[PDB]
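Thread: Carbonic anhydrase 2, structure

OP (GT): Posting the sequence first so everyone is looking at the same thing. Length is 257 residues per the record. Can we get the structure tokens written out before standup tomorrow? I want them in the notebook alongside the other entries.
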Amino acid sequence: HWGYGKHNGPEHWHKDFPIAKGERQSPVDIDTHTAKYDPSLKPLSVSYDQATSLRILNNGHAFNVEFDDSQDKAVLKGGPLDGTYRLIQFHFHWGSLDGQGSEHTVDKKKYAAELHLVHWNTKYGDFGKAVQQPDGLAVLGIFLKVGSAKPGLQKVVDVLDSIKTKGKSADFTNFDPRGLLPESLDYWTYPGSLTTPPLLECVTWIVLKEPISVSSEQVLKFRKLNFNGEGEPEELMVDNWRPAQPLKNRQIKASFK
């Protein structure tokens, strides 16, 4: 029964998921004055030309755009990563107000939302095995600010009415995630965790420095989703973000000067 509400929010998660107080929890604040350039980081390689989206699902805490991950169709390599990581899904976190919504922060700045493109290390064969490994996942995180619309997001926005409530899914084929990327692939990276229960410490985070812009209208449509199932009391799906967790014995590295 975890969530983002008054009585079940992030500050309660530790009771059912004790790793919430672990050594490598995410998100974190990215301090641009202490993150150090690492010249031995490589450019990231984002290879999404063959991506096959299938479906969009409201899971009661966000919505996931799901991909066919049964072949190397959409993969992330390079950067800090060794080997090949396959795209499985993306989802967002967002706020009730434009001054909040992101999970990572930059010098304590909160963005309006954050996109997570989740990839698993093919050496482990499937997602469920991957999340049990320290290097099982690579999550590409991208900040969203409100300004000009992002054309490449509109097809996502378009479909939200069809998945208003928890447990609803809709076919969502032929969506191109390249339309969600900023111009630059400059990034910060650090070891951490999933940001929802089970909070497993299996993630190499790759957080892009450049945000994407989305429009007010686009964000407003995200805020019409519901946490609840159909025929239950409406509770708007907003503020579905975990706050920054202690960095502990970690360093954030930058791919850029």
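GT: Both are above now. Quick notes for whoever picks this up: The helical segments are 127-130, 154-159, 216-222. The two ends are 43 Å apart (CA to CA).
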